[PDB]
Write a protein that binds this ligand. Structure first.
Ligand SMILES: OC[C@H]1O[C@@H](O[C@H]2[C@H](O)[C@@H](O)[C@@H](O)O[C@@H]2CO)[C@H](O)[C@@H](O)[C@H]1O
Ligand SMILES: [Ca+2]
Ligand SMILES: [Mg+2]
Ligand SMILES: [Mg+2]
Length: 758
């Protein structure tokens, strides 16, 4: 029953700016989106907005932008007297509801989504008398504010002179048309996009600049239906008309469709009724959040996908990342498997294929960021599309969870080959020393190297920034140490490839931190990163590797290999199954032999040193750069021996290391590069926390995992309030940072509800 969970997130708001941002540039209100639609709605905040759902949020290809404060807001007149209504408004999973109550007239408005482009409003009017209905709307004028305060006096029309918004009428409603705007970071339209309003009765619409007023007379009680459609191309506009007509012909079919779909999400999803009411509401919040970030096919992305946040400054539209998808799809397999499947298809739909025009050397590669608009390199004008790096190998894990739920063999058959191609890419383009253990690295890209193939880097000394190129040059510079710091685009890309941007283990340490490290008796050379080019015997530059093998990716590949073997077995490929099991076993051996340090009782990346060690390992574990969440990856993924897991868990539970106010953060308190304000050098993310708890359970420490989950529930700020889900937490204070409505936080909070709030 969706009605048991009213207002889990605050969805009220009356936007006054196209960009009505919070402190960190995210839209500061939380509109309701469903069915992968490309528009969203808010609840009225009071008398000024009652009668409508203010703040039509448009997803303009890659960004969320508000269109209007009031739009299609109802006012009711009875014999020339304006009805003064009492307002009650709330959200439930799958709907917005607004009730307007007066003596002689009552209105109940229920807003649900009907198609991937269309929301449906039921306006149920009860009256003992005929009434005159007036709907009004006005497009926004002002561009941008922060925390409700204008950032400039720019106007929408001033900033985007080609936008040239215009309202037009039809017999059953109205529409807004939009000119072509290609503002790479702000506002992207085709020139054919429209926002259409159609109703189940004729209305008389007048237009005055960027305002409208529509009228209708009714003889008494009636239920009216209204469709709202954001359509992004001429082809979408044409296709949606038949759906709109069907919706207005049989609105009950669509309302029931949405009611039933949401009853199923909650029935399948809420499988821990012994959780506390507050814990259950957190799960419901997570479900609402995940489904709201789902987007239907659009532009270059021909599948339903899920983005990190529909309200996010840089996460909105249909911008899609691989390891976000793997995590989200894993969680959503347990309540919305149809879309989990789609999301996985969306990512792999842009896997690099043989003969690729841009990077034929990268067959099997999965781009880091795909979106509506292709990059200039692929013939589009998209500024977000990114092929500098991929993300870690969690794909097979998510594919197999969708199979576990659906038991659909056709699914395994379609994904298996894409998973294999991805695996093969790692081993061709990210294994410099040919030992079957991957490195993180960087593709051949304008960001990383010259046209002729020389790696870029910048030397900084005082106020000087000296851009340079060439690996030979880089090696000479670092041996010599004549600089204050270095900026290396390939290093940044390697950290992005791990998903842990600017993490300590990849050589990221601030000047003060490094100075303290050296003062304490460490060497500056302990933090220098080395690189190698990966080149085929025929001269083709494949990319760059960090001369470092990372324990998380080794562990993820280990489990990925075992899932591949499970898929091969299901598909009657016994030899391929054997090969993946054997590859998995070798990775476990390497992880335990090379990446485990018995002295500090933890796992670490290893260097690829000039010569291998006596035990065959590429180099020693990088104990100097401190402990991080990669250290429990061998537990999560099942690579660790029991003895090694025993050791790791002791460190996890040590308040000196990871057992902080909010525990299991992204660097131990003992890590020389730790900061409680640094995203991937101390802050706690829900994915890495849950990976830790699952790792603990896998090796016999479930009871300890339950205690850490309880500590998280008590100390993570905002968890039981009605605010949107964010990205991470301060490990010392529990304070939140990051984009609101963040998908993988929602994913892993949901799985924490499922697995560890018990
Ligand atoms: O561009 C690919 C990288 O994007 C990063 O995500 C955000 C980033 O957090 C934000 O600060 C801003 O720069 O936009 C980016 C998306 O374009 C990822 O964290 C990084 O790993 C890469 O995927
Ligand atoms: Ca290697
Ligand atoms: Mg019970
Ligand atoms: Mg670009």
């Amino acid at each position: 029953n969706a009605d048991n969970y009213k207002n889990v997130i605050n969805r009220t708001g009356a936007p006054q700016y196209m960009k009505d941002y919070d402190y960190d540039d995210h839209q500061r209100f939380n509109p309701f989106f469903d069915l992968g639609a490309w528009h969203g709605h808010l609840l009225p905040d009071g008398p000024n907005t009652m009668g409508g759902f203010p703040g039509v949020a448009l997803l303009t290809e890659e960004y969320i932008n508000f269109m209007a404060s009031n739009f299609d807001r109802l006012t009711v007149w009875q014999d020339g007297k304006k009805v003064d209504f009492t307002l009650e408004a709330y959200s439930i999973p799958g709907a917005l509801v607004q009730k307007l109550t007066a003596k002689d007239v009552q209105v109940e408005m229920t807003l649900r989504f009907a198609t991937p482009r269309t929301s449906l409003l039921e306006t149920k009017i009860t009256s003992n008398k005929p009434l005159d209905l007036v709907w009004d709307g006005e497009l926004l004028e002002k561009l941008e504010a922060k925390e409700g305060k204008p950032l400039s006096d720019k106007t929408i029309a001033g900033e985007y002179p080609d936008y040239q918004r215009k309202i037009s009428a039809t017999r059953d409603g109205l529409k807004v048309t939009f000119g072509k705007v290609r503002a790479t970071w702000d506002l992207l339209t085709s020139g054919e996009s429209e926002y259409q309003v159609h109703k189940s009765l004729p209305v008389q619409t007048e237009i005055n600049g960027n305002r409208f007023t529509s009228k209708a007379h009714i003889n008494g009680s009636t239920t009216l239906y209204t469709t709202y459609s954001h359509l992004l191309t001429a082809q979408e506009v044409s296709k949606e008309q038949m759906q709109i007509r069907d919706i207005l012909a049989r609105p009950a079919f669509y309302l029931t469709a949405s009611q039933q779909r949401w009853e199923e999400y909650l029935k399948k999803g809420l499988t821990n009724p012994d959780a506390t009411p507050e814990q259950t509401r957190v799960a419901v919040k997570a479900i609402e959040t995940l489904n709201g970030n789902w987007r239907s096919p659009g532009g270059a992305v021909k599948f339903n996908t899920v983005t990190p946040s529909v309200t996010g400054r840089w996460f909105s539209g249909n911008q899609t990342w691989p390891w976000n998808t793997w995590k989200q799809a894993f969680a959503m397999a347990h309540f919305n498997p149809d879309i989990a499947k789609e999301n996985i298809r969306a990512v792999f739909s842009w896997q690099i294929q043989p003969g690729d025009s841009v990077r034929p050397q990268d067959v099997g590669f999965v781009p880091d960021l795909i979106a509506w608009n292709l990059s200039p390199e692929r013939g589009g004008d998209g500024g977000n599309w990114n092929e500098r790096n991929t993300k870690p190998s969690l794909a097979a894990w998510s594919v197999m969870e969708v199979y576990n739920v659906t038991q659909d063999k056709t699914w395994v058959a379609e994904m298996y080959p894409k998973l294999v191609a991805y695996h093969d890419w790692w081993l061709r383009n990210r294994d410099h020393n040919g030992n079957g253990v991957p490195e993180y690295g960087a593709t051949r890209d304008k960001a990383h190297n010259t046209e002729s193939g020389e790696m870029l880097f910048t030397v900084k000394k005082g106020d000087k920034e000296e851009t340079q190129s060439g690996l030979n040059n880089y090696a000479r510079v670092v041996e010599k140490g004549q600089y204050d710091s270095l900026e290396i685009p390939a290093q940044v890309a390697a950290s992005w490839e791990s998903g842990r941007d600017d993490a300590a283990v990849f050589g990221f340490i601030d000047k003060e931190q490094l100075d303290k490290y050296v003062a304490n008796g460490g060497k500056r050379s302990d933090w220098t990163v080395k690189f190698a080019e990966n080149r085929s015997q025929d001269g083709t530059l494949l990319g760059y590797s960090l001369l470092q093998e990372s324990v998380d990716q080794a562990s993820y590949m280990y489990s990925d290999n075992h899932y591949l073997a499970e898929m091969a077995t299901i598909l009657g490929k016994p030899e391929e199954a054997k090969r993946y099991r054997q590859l998995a076993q070798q990775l476990a051996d390497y992880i335990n032999t090379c990446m485990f340090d018995p002295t500090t009782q933890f796992y670490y990346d290893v260097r690829i040193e000039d010569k291998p060690l006596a035990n065959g390992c590429a180099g020693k574990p990088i104990v100097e750069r401190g402990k991080g969440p990669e250290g429990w990856s061998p537990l999560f993924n099942g690579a660790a021996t029991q003895a090694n897991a025993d050791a790791v868990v002791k460190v996890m539970l040590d308040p000196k290391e990871f057992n902080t106010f909010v525990p299991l953060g992204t660097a131990a308190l003992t890590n020389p590069a730790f900061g409680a304000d640094i995203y991937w050098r101390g802050r706690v993310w829900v994915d890495q926390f849950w990976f830790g708890l699952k790792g603990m359970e896998r090796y016999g420490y479930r009871d300890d995992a339950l205690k850490l989950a309880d500590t998280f529930f008590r100390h993570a700020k905002g968890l039981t309030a009605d605010g949107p889900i964010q990205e991470n937490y301060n490990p010392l204070t529990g304070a939140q940072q990051g984009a609101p409505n963040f998908s993988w936080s929602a994913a892993h909070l949901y799985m924490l509800y499922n697995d560890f709030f018990r």
